């Protein structure tokens, strides 16, 4: 919820979009087309995996029995052992629930961020030839074909080719 994109001004996500986290749905003369962005999908996934590899880590740290399940140890040292072990369970349990809550916050906001980095980038590409309507869409103010879309996608769309055209139309 940090950046306003996901669950903000974009109304929802696309259950038909199997091959990515982020992508494009366009409407022009020829037809309607959908394809998911690689560069930013890859980007997020990579930050998630980098989180995982950090936690799915193995501690190389060995502990032995101070205790005895078969003949109980003397009762006083038994009680110190138990009290300490319970105190560590508190620390670890708190750490566990905290780490997980925090990583989750961050993972969700990592996602809001990358969406709102796709957007703000495409916006930048199109300069003055289109407009923010505000539901995660750009109304293009010039006729455009399906090879014009692809050039936005793979980041080649030239503006000062369609500038004047789209400007009187505003």
């Amino acid at each position: 919820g940090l950046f306003g994109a996901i669950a903000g001004f974009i109304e929802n996500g696309w259950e038909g979009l199997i091959d990515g986290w982020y992508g494009f749905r366009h409407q022009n003369a020829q037809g309607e087309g959908t394809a998911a962005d690689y560069k930013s999908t890859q980007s997020a996934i990579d930050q998630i995996t980098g989180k995982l590899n950090r936690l799915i880590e193995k501690t190389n740290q060995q502990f032995e029995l101070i205790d005895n399940e078969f003949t109980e140890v003397e009762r006083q040292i038994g009680n110190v052992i138990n009290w300490t072990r319970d105190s560590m369970t508190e620390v670890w349990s708190y750490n566990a629930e905290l780490l997980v809550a925090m990583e989750n916050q961050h993972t969700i906001d990592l996602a809001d961020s990358e969406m709102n980095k796709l957007y703000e980038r495409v916006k930048r590409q199109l300069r003055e030839n289109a407009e923010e309507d505000g539901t995660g869409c750009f109304e293009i103010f010039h006729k455009c074909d399906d090879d014009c879309m692809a050039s936005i996608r793979n980041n080649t769309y030239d503006h000062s080719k369609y500038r004047e055209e789209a400007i009187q139309n505003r």
């Binding site: 996901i6 669950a7 109304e11 929802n12 996500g13 696309w14 259950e15 979009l17 199997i18 986290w21 982020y22 992508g23 494009f24 749905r25 366009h26 409407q27 962005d37 997020a44 995982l52 936690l55 799915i56 880590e57 193995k58 501690t59 190389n60 060995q62 502990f63 032995e64 029995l65 101070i66 205790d67 005895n68 399940e69 078969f70 003949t71 140890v73 072990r85 369970t89 670890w92 349990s93 750490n95 566990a96 629930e97 997980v100 809550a101 925090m102 990583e103 989750n104 916050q105 993972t107 969700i108 809001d112 969406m115 796709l118 995660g136 869409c137 750009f138 109304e139 293009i140 879309m149």
Partner: protein, 316 residues
């Protein structure tokens, strides 16, 4: 007319928790607490010794049940609930410290203490350690007066640890079932045993007298122990009631010791054990057993803690 960017979504996602909200649905999430036990001891690739009817402390003194374990080698030592340390009734003083040492020993290697004896008996036995008829602890010698009632001489025996690693030394004090029995075994008069080294100094007086019969014996033997540092010398002095060690023990290396109630399995690989099996997992935490040992995920209270691996899931 328009182009629109947007993110993916699934129809039924999973609830997680955040700093800020509870049960927020995300696209994909993953578990972080291990809940799955393997009800076996996973010993693949490890030198395992399962002690069975032998008690860990028996490996040191050597009652009949431990005959196959006087000199073992292990990476992983398994104690059982049926395990017994003792043939002739008695206890180890400070048993748990001694268990802990033995569990991590890598097993033991025995060396003779080089004691010999003049003008006493050396071969006292009892029907409580049965080998073929009466026997005794295999690593110990029950020292007796030459004949019934005879005076047991004032003796001194000493042993120097000339090896390069610390030696484990055991001996026993015999508490006869009656005063008569004490003097029969050892002659009349006050008995005193002392045991000294440079880091150790203690003395012991037997307390002969009536105990119930356990394994048909009214007397008791109490074992005591010490670690002798390389180059230090133990000295025993005694005029009876003394159970002498025949062999010292040396620790072999490094091992793990566990207590278990489940079978061994040389097919699965595991490094975290508890009485009810092995915890095999990569996750950072576990909710299976707070007493697990080895290299374990940290134990926590919670049954589950899901880590988001996806984004906010917003459907139609």
């Amino acid at each position: 007319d328009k182009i629109c960017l947007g993110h993916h979504a699934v129809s039924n996602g999973t609830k997680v928790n955040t700093l800020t909200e509870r049960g927020v649905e995300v696209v994909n999430a993953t578990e972080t607490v291990e809940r799955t036990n393997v009800p076996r001891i996973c010993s693949k690739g490890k030198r395992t010794v399962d002690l069975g009817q032998c008690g860990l402390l028996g490996t040191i003194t050597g009652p009949p049940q431990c005959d196959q374990f006087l000199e073992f080698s292990a990476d992983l030592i398994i104690e059982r609930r049926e395990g017994s340390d003792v043939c002739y009734p008695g206890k180890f003083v400070n048993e748990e410290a001694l268990r802990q040492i033995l569990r991590e020993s890598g097993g033991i290697d025995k060396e003779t203490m080089g004691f010999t004896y003049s003008g006493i008996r050396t071969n006292g036995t009892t029907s409580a350690c049965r080998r073929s008829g009466s026997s005794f602890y295999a690593e110990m010698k029950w020292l007796l007066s030459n004949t019934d009632n005879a005076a047991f001489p004032q003796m001194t025996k000493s042993y120097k640890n000339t090896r390069k690693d610390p030696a484990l030394i055991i001996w026993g004090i015999h508490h006869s079932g009656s005063t008569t029995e004490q003097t029969k075994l050892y002659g009349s008069g006050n008995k005193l045993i002392t045991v000294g080294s440079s880091n150790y100094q203690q003395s012991f007086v037997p307390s002969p007298g009536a105990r119930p019969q356990v394994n048909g014996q009214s007397g008791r033997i109490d074992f005591h122990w010490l670690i002798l540092n390389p180059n230090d010398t133990v000295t025993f002095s005694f005029n009876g009631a003394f159970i002498a060690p025949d062999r010292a023990s040396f620790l072999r290396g490094k091992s793990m010791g566990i207590q278990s109630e489940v079978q061994v399995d040389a097919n699965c690989e595991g490094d975290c054990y508890h009485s009810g099996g092995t915890i095999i997992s990569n996750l950072p935490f576990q909710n299976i057993n707070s007493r697990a040992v080895g290299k374990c995920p940290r134990y926590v209270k919670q049954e589950s803690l899901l880590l988001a691996t996806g984004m906010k899931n917003v459907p139609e």
